[PDB]
Amino acid sequence: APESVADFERLLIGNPNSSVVWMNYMAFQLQLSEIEKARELAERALKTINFREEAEKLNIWIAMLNLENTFGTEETLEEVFSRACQYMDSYTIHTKLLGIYEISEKFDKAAELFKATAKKFGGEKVSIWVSWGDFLISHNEEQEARTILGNALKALPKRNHIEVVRKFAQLEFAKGDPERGRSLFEGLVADAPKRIDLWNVYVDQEVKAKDKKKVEDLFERIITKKITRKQAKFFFNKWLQFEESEGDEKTIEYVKAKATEYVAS
Amino acid sequence: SQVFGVARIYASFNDTFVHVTDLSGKETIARVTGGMKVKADRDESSPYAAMLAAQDVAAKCKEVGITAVHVKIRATGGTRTKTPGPGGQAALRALARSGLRIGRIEDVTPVPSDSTRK
Amino acid sequence: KGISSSAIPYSRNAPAWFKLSSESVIEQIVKYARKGLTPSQIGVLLRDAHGVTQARVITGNKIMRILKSNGLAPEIPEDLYYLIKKAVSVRKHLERNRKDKDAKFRLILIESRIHRLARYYRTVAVLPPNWKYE
Amino acid sequence: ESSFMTLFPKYRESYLKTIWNDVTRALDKHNIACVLDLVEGSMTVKTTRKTYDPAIILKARDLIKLLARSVPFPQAVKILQDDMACDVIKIGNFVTNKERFVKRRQRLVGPNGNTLKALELLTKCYILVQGNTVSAMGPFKGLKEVRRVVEDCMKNIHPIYHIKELMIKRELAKR
């Protein structure tokens, strides 16, 4: 392959905008102990890429940032993010910096990047809340994760805080606490009392985390609840599929019984 | 010869506060907020309630020892009315009428400085 | 829009205080132009320091023709060259802070103003076809 | 000892020079002094030694800044009695665009001034919509009513709703 300072320049005449091949050539030069020509390739990749194609420039920035996080410097990673900011939106560049810090396993730099997100993008939207929840969940403090997510949800609007709470509950069912996930699910079903979009989210999260007696019973309550025929049959069929995955034929039949009870009125 | 408190009177709408701390403000003396002298729940912002509160404030200021008072008159401020209510004049008139010397009128209402309403 | 331009005199003559030679002007022009200087800058420096009024009056003909006859031609005409470099400067500035929509709008303007004199230069065939704005 | 001061715009000096002796007679009855400076364009007001009402320097301050904010002298003097106060409503920070802002402010003024004059009659106040603020003199219930009608007029609801409910509340408090 193209993996030098001569052969890569000679063989890149067909595709000068080759982002992945330029990243592989830069990593091959860095493994070949040429950090100077590696960084030269990583900086000239976005220049040999087109101007209007911002994603290729962001890929060259991520390649130089990964090379700096592996065998470079934090000043080069900040240049790579300023470069990322010179190749894209500043919040996405700082999130790429947080990802490079998480790949370099610097916990203090990861927390500082999540805090710099949770100020500006935390007052903007919920992506910084998701980033703070990701950092504190990898740090294994779900209390501080939920506190930072609630703080960023207070800083940002609250109209997407319901889906943020459902995402927090699904993440807690995935790799956190199941009682905390069920509590956040009940809080989300309280905040959306008119919408069963939190009820099906709770049922799917419990069935994903193998809480069958939770998921099928709550979905049976939702199917026999104040719903229509389609809204009852969907929840009851999902609960019956979860109950048959657990091994409960009579409960899968009683789910359809509650569906027939709620559809006829 | 005079020893000074500070009045810290607060003439909101719907109430009047007379709260005479020492010259720092850390240590308070004789808070007799209006809506406790006489309450019909309407007359709590009235000049009569303000002068009753100021007169027994001045009674406790004289029993502690304070003879003169720097007076700071504060309206409800913020993103709201910013003008003192009916009781701010009557409170310091009664504090001056009931033997207590008055100094240094100043308005310390919170002008909100480019506030938050959108 | 405003009336802001230059007012060429009624005289097509040498200014009669201009004792300087009518050939050393051309040598000074080719000195600046092969030390690498654009023709508007040639004309304004020849005006300001080695003071000529404009060289079409004092020399035989205009200075882009002087450069072309002295073998010193530009690859691309000057107006189109400066519009190209302004477009690529604002394009590098755009591929930077992707939220400067205003600069996106004025990139639309600069490219729409590229194409006008580019197709003018194609119909005159100053620079040839198969030139398609990189 | 106390002293306050406002500074007034240049076009007011030919009016303030006229009514200044009446200012001196309306404050020397309260035993409080005042100068106006014509070269720096200011009006200051000082508590003298013969002043036994300490609150009157605040009302004299409100008086001279009303003379700054362009309210006529016989309209302005009513501050000097106790059941009368100022309010300066701020309207500039409600809506974004200039067109809708001046249309809602002209809506606060009214066709031929009818909304503003009816509001003055109902609230017993003196109201000047001016620039991007609304000054008002009145009793404190009138100040409360005029603040709620102006701050709800900058929101979409028409102020003749408030004029209607003020007439309803007057003839509904008359029983």
Next chain:
RNA sequence: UAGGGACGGUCGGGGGCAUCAGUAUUCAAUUGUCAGAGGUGAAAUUCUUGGAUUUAUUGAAGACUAACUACUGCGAAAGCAUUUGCCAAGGACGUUUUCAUUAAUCAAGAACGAAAGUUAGGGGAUCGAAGAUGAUCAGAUACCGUCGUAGUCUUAA
């Protein structure tokens, strides 16, 4: 005294990023003091002797840029007011600089955003974020493929 481009000193609350400041508001901590304090035309829900309200010292949060602020400025319009720096840009003027008709008006198409979702009853046929399912890559909930909730439909606020 058509048009375009260069230069020069600039001009502007034009834009993007970063920085800095301001005092309110809200919350928390620490005191001091005691019985009430919101709010209203009156009241009430609410806050309250593990001390509220007020006062003083802080800290944190998200906004926002008071006056100055104008029949003023800038922007193609929507719009744009704290400082400083960077990134490009724009306009008027000055010009004895340059090119030489390079020009004017508007049918498709777009970036913009002032430009939206306040609470409730109801039908869900389709689609369907949220949730989950198999391979790509040191790393892939997107890519490819489906089940599937609100919503997408309606009516008043």
